[PDB]
Design a protein around this nucleic acid. Structure first.
Ligand SMILES: [Zn+2]
Lengths: 95, 241, 108, 123
RNA sequence: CGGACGGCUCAGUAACACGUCGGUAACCUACCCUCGGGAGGGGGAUAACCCCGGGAAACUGGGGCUAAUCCCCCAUAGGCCUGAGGUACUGGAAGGUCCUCAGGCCGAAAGGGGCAUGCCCGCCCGAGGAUGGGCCGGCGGCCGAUUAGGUAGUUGGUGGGGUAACGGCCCACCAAGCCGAAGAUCGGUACGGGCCAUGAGAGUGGGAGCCCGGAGAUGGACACUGAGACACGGGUCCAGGCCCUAC
């Protein structure tokens, strides 16, 4: 699977880096959040924490999925801005 | 049957001056009473969320608003219902961004980016005059605001002139009159967002408003109403359009 | 007072406070011309005018009439047959909301 | 037969006792705002209230309750019942601003229809 | 503080109810914005809490103790009426606003709370706006003559009461007017529009679902509190129906 960053965007008010990326998986299924996070952090020098994946989406026939990710400066601002359902869905918090 | 005032607003019934999706949902933010009208203003949350894109939901927008990270006319505004309007200035000092609110040739409101120097001035149109106790003159402006002046200098302020003012402290500079060579910016009607110079005024009897003719720099002439002709300069503009 | 219509005032005077000229009554809205049809009431006049309505299906016209009741001050004392000018004001009685301001042509 | 609740405005304590027989018939006909000696009924206060209360002390009728649970309202004359559409107290608790309800109250006079009688010690 | 919004329905209504253009110089408006000004001095009660309870319940009594951004009172600002003058403002046009004088009625406020060694949220008055409403007007849109005369506060005037405000809205007095064959009155059916179905088009027919407006909350009538109700999940009565009961 390849991961190709299409856009990065900066937010000073909430203190976040928004990231739009494409995933290329020709012949394979839709990949997993763990793997996508590993690749993202390895490639952009980010913390495995303070990083969440809002969605990975597949289309009708593409073998090319899309993603949206957010990288925060501080775990505190993170837990304050982001709701709990994505945190549980990612694994950064135990319900 | 209705026993009182309204507190909701549906999206199919929202004014046309807005950039909004009408079928995505059923409900819209009803603005609160304030400076401008409903047909001439848009709340702040729509700016924070749908124009600039600093938030995707409304909780995030409320959160940034309740921390003084956004100003309007040099003042902090925490209410997501506050109506923003024409000739107003939106300032984000954490990103160095300054926008001025203006309409299009279509009638919709937009954000024109300006500089920090011009972000400290706001033009006002004198809409009426009154004499109040202490024998003082009260000018009633176009955003619903008011200014006090002495009697000695009453003949210098009339009911269509324009006044430039430092926004937060609200001190006057550079009055501009309504004459036959003044620069103009139309704010409503069929010829909205056009610009040009005045040529002729015309009056009518028994309640009908006054009309004015204007010439654009391509040389073409067009008429409109006198209350729609915002004065912004003498020979050239003082702000950015 | 010089009300905002650009007509000439009458060559009389009254004490009635319900006269646009000489009094405290103020006019606003629309103003039309008509002909007097009846003046059998005191300080009241019936004014009539006419227009054409268009029938879209039959491609032709239809003459229609319009009646109003107007206040009639004593400085401007119109009678049946006068061509007159009336203007709108606040409700004066159950059926009167217009007032006569000038007689344009007096009948014999 | 009456249950007397005798209260002292000195300490804030009250005691419940019974009265039956002819000493009870001395109350029927009496109203609210009228004073009565304690011996008139056949009981002394040092016996029951506790330590000691002087003699010469009389009792004041402040309220009462009918055998069906309807209280007495001073400003209603008679030993009978009424429905009056009152707006405050005694005998109703509003629970809202401008709320009114038609209630069932007993009158200003004592009658054999009563069970409870509230007395206040005078000094 | 809010619950007068939102949500449901189409009974009634042929009407300024609806649509559109205009008007209020004849009116009200808590939450909101701007500007200009103020927060002085005293008093009081009473829930919770404690003692004793009553009634089958629903509900409810007596005594003691206490606080407030609760309630009351003085003062000052200010609000309203009238009369005589000056003419500064707006406006197309002043029974309006401003200035001076005079005679009188009503009559504010919480410097409270938080952090801290000044900042945040707030209280009252005034002038204006916005939001939302009330009222008026011109035009426009069903069928019936085996329904032809109707109206008697009915049409107008003078003077007043009452309303937030104009007004026969109501009252006293003077007159005899108002609508009608270009169809009044009466009777029938029916929430009104944007819209929809059909047709080459003209045109015919409908108007439950989504939006704007109106009306109603078993039938009918009447009131309290509040900026706003004669109030679907708050009140009072009559009629008609049903339920619990220790009757
Ligand atoms: Zn006259």
């Amino acid at each position: 699977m390849e991961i190709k960053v299409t856009e990065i965007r900066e937010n000073k008010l909430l203190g976040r880096k928004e990231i739009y990326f494409d995933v290329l998986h020709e012949g394979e299924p839709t990949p997993s959040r763990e793997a996508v996070k590993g690749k993202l952090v390895a490639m952009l020098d980010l913390d495995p924490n303070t990083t969440v994946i809002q969605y990975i989406r597949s289309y009708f026939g593409s073998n090319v999925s899309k993603g949206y990710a957010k990288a925060y400066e501080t775990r505190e601002r993170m837990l304050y801005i982001e709701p709990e359902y994505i945190l549980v869905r990612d694994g950064l918090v135990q319900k | 049957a209705r026993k009182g005032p309204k507190r909701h607003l549906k999206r199919l019934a929202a004014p046309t001056s807005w950039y909004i999706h009408r079928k995505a949902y059923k409900w819209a933010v009803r603005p609160s009473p304030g400076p401008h009208s409903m047909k001439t203003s848009i709340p702040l949350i729509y700016i924070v969320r749908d124009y600039l894109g600093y938030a995707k939901t409304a909780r995030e927008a409320r959160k940034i608003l309740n921390e003084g990270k956004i100003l309007v006319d040099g003042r902090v505004r925490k209410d997501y219902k506050f109506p923003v309007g024409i000739m107003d200035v939106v300032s984000i000092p954490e990103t160095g961004e300054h926008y001025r609110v203006l309409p299009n040739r279509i009638g919709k409101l937009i954000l024109h980016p300006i500089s920090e120097e011009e972000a400290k001035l706001k033009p006002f149109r004198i809409n009426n005059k009154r004499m109040v106790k202490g024998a003082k003159v009260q000018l009633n402006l176009h955003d619903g605001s008011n200014h006090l002046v002495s009697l000695a200098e009453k003949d210098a302020y009339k009911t269509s002139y324009t006044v430039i003012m430092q926004v937060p402290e609200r001190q006057i500079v550079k009055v501009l009159p309504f004459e036959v060579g003044a620069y103009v910016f139309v704010t409503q009607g069929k010829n909205v967002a056009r610009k040009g110079k005045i040529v002729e005024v015309r009056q009518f009897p028994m309640g009908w408003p006054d009309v004015v003719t204007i010439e654009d720099e391509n040389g073409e002439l067009f008429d409109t109403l006198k209350e729609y002709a915002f004065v912004i300069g003498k020979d050239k503009p003082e702000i950015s359009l | 007072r010089e009300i905002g219509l650009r007509v000439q005032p009458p060559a009389e005077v009254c004490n009635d406070p319900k006269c646009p000229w000489h009094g405290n009554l103020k006019i606003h809205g629309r103003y039309v011309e008509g002909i007097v049809v009846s003046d059998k009431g005191k300080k009241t006049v019936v004014v009539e005018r006419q227009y054409y309505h268009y029938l879209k299906k039959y491609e032709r016209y239809e003459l229609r009439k319009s009646k109003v009741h107007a206040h009639n001050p004593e400085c401007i004392n119109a009678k049946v047959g006068d061509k007159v000018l009336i203007a709108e004001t606040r409700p004066i009685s159950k059926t009167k909301s217009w007032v006569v301001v000038a007689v344009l042509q007096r009948a014999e | 037969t009456f249950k007397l609740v005798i209260s002292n405005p000195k300490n804030g304590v009250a005691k419940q006792v019974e009265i039956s027989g002819p000493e009870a018939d001395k109350l029927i006909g009496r109203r609210i705002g009228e004073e009565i000696p304690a011996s008139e009924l056949g009981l002394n206060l040092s016996e029951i209230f506790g330590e000691e209360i002087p003699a010469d002390a009389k009792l004041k009728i402040t309220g009462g309750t009918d055998k069906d649970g309807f209280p007495m309202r001073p400003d209603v004359h008679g030993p009978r019942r009424v429905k009056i559409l009152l707006s405050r107290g005694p005998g109703f608790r509003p629970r809202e601003r401008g709320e009114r309800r038609k209630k069932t109250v007993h009158g200003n006079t004592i009658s054999p229809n009563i069970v409870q009688v509230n007395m206040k010690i005078v000094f």
